[model samples]
Target: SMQEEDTFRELRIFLRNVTHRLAIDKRFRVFTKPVDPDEVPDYRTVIKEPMDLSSVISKIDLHKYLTVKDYLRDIDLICSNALEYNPDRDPGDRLIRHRACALRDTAYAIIKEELDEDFEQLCEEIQESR
Candidate 1:
């Protein structure tokens, strides 16, 4: 149906624009790729399940994302992991913690702007089962 196509089109384009925005930002460079295991062996210990922007991009094209909120999880994890290891309590945490802050803030802004209409519907889908 036209409705199905239109709905999916909106979601697809929205996510495409989202990833594009994240990748293009110089601040997001640190998160664009997987953290080298050798460099940050400590990271692997704390983050049992890691997420990265480049990996998410590959999944999106393969239709790995079915809902915007679900995609938000991975995107959030990308920055959140940064904040976790580099806790904002100290000076060394400055750039890493703040980087995640800006990245996450913008991601939410774009998602809300594009899918505000489905804001409630989003929860219903997941909650209906719960």
Candidate 2:
């Protein structure tokens, strides 16, 4: 069960976004949902290419970052990895980015709260450990 659960999810969300983008935009008619990404008809054969950068950059919501450092790191990572996936056909990329950003921010907030509580305990320990 562990192995099954641990198996790759195929990151289908990325692939699905690509398909949706192609369908909505007129230029990428040939970019149908691939039964298998490995068996594509070849990029050279694809008729249209989109060069819009707005969606890619606006993917993550910086407001979700709890700390300034965490916010900055997410921005850095999103920028760095923007080009790793094609933004042309993936409209949902923005939504996914926001979700991840929110998740990270939430995690940081919880951790920070816990750390504050532990810090008080740490002071007590130092006095006892002495």
Candidate 3:
């Protein structure tokens, strides 16, 4: 269980850094559920809200935008490595590893799909702007 928690914690840090690098506008707060005035913010309570396309485009530098392909590629590599990882030693250790693997797979699938659909168009638009 601790291992699974650590894996998720590492994943969160990676994603948070990625989000910061992307320089998303702060005007829109993304939350999956209504925030309670008293509750601390955590990943489960938040989902990234839909960004305004114009604001997103305006914030992106063409050079950094081009690196999106590489970023996605890196993520894919990490996901594959995570899926292939075999760290468990005992039969009793099965459930946590399975859940962690599932989480990794799901994240990779979603990210890969998004990149497949948008990365090409984004690159084309940036190239045309030059």
Candidate 4:
């Protein structure tokens, strides 16, 4: 029972870390160069549509923090709540495992800034899609 709990906990960590990285990495994959004021994506409009993050990181004002510790606390709450476990989605199943791993790896890659610094610089990168 403890082992199962441990496995679930590990899965949660893996998923959170990987997904964060994936979100960050996506920023570096942008093709369109910033040309002019018209070229920049408006926050209001961009929020409605899918974004290429590296460009949005600086443009977006994610938060107004009292201090770095406060900022980190907010971040911690965000990450903790993100990958909350769902028992209905059994990890034993092949499809579920595949999906979980994909999410985790993508997140890890994004947060690691393997793709771009714009990703790492952003305080919040990805929100859980589901």
Q: Whose TM-score is higher: candidate 1's or candidate 4's?
A: 1
Clashing pairs in 3: none
Worst 10 residues of 2 by lDDT: 4-13
lDDT string for model 4 (1-130, tens) is 5654453344345334433444555332321223233654452342332322233332223323312233234334322322332224555444433443454444444545533444323312221211
lDDT tens per residue, model 3, 1-130: 5654453344334444444433342321221123343663542243233222233333332323343444454434333332333356665345435543444455456556544445446445544565
| Model 4 weakest lDDT span, ten residues long | 121-130
- List where candidate 1 sits over 4 angstroms from the true fold: 1-6, 88-90, 116-130
Clashing pairs in 2: 21-89
- What is the clash tally of candidate 1? 0
Estimate the Cα RMSD of every predicted model relative to the unseen true structure: 3.3, 15.6, 16.5, 16.5
Per-candidate local distance difference test: 0.78, 0.35, 0.40, 0.35
Clash pairs of candidate 1? none
- lDDT per residue as tens, model 1, 38-70: 988888999877888888888877876767877
lDDT of 3: 0.40
Cα misplacement distance, residue 117 of candidate 3 (Å): 3.8
Shift in Å, residue 59, candidate 4: 12
Better TM-score candidate (1, 3) = 1
